[PDB]
């Protein structure tokens, strides 16, 4: 009869299957396919560095189960 | 070739279809069905009150599109 919302404290992770040769831009494209956030609204942070679109995951020592941080850019 | 995880700042809401006569116990059961969180691990908080299992949504004047807060209750 009525809709209510329950705000949860749960943290969302985007889980992606990637190759070490994938560029940061390719990862942003995958995030866009999953979430509809354009690449230019995405900052990907790893180990205190904003990752550059043209570099690869392997360049940054990103390994299996590494956690990146997505921060939106308005 | 490998799994990676991208942590996001996005807030998750559980959307429930409920009746004013539903008890808080009924609401917690619905959350369990959707998310596998047992009722004893759920605190539901609204308007500065922890909602009691035996009382109804109507008892709390919870209306359409009210945003309850789920706070996990663990030992």
Numbering used by the authors:
A (entry chain B): 0 to 73
B (entry chain A): 0 to 74
Paper lines:
We explored this idea using the model virus Turnip Yellow Mosaic Virus (TYMV), which encodes a vDUB known as PRO that suppresses Ub-dependent antiviral responses and is vital to virus replication as a protease that processes the viral polyprotein. The tightest binding UbV (UbV3) was chosen for further study and was found to block both polyprotein cleavage and DUB activity of PRO in vitro. X-ray structures of UbV3 in isolation and bound to PRO reveal that the inhibitor exists as a dimer that binds two copies of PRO. UbV3 blocked polyprotein cleavage activity that is essential for TYMV replication, and also, DUB activity that usurps cellular Ub-dependent antiviral mechanisms.
G10 is located in a loop between strands β1 and β2 of Ub, and its substitution to valine or alanine destabilizes the β1-β2 loop, causing strand β1 to engage with strands β2 and β5 of another UbV3 monomer to form a stable dimer with β1 strands exchanged. An X-ray structure of UbV3 revealed that it indeed forms a dimeric structure, as suggested from the chromatography studies. Strand β1 of each UbV3 monomer was exchanged to form hydrogen bonds with strand β2 and strand β5 of the partnering UbV3 monomer within the dimer. The resulting β-sheet formed by these strands holds the dimer together. The extended loops between strands β1 and β2 that link the monomers together do not show any appreciable interactions with each other, suggesting structural flexibility in this region. There are 7 amino acid substitutions in UbV3 with respect to WT Ub (F4L, K6R, L8P, T9F, G10V, K11Q, T12F). Just downstream of strand β1, L8 substituted to proline in UbV3, where the proline has a cis-peptide bond that enables the backbone atoms to adopt similar positions to that found for the T7-L8 peptide bond of Ub. However, the backbone dihedral angles of F9 of UbV3 were changed dramatically (φ = -83.1°, ψ = 141.3°), compared to that of T9 (φ = -101.4°, ψ = 14.9°) in WT Ub, and those of V10 in UbV3 were also changed (φ = -92.3°, ψ = 129.3°) compared to G10 (φ = 77.4°, φ = 16.5°) of WT Ub. These angular changes reflect the change of the β1-β2 loop from a type I β-turn in WT Ub to an extension that reaches out to engage with the partnering monomer in the UbV3 dimer. Indeed, the pyrrolidine ring of P8 and aromatic ring of F9 are ~3 Å apart and appear to form a C-H/π interaction that places the F9 sidechain in an orientation that helps stabilize the extended conformation of the β1-β2 loop along with the G10V substitution to form the UbV3 dimer.
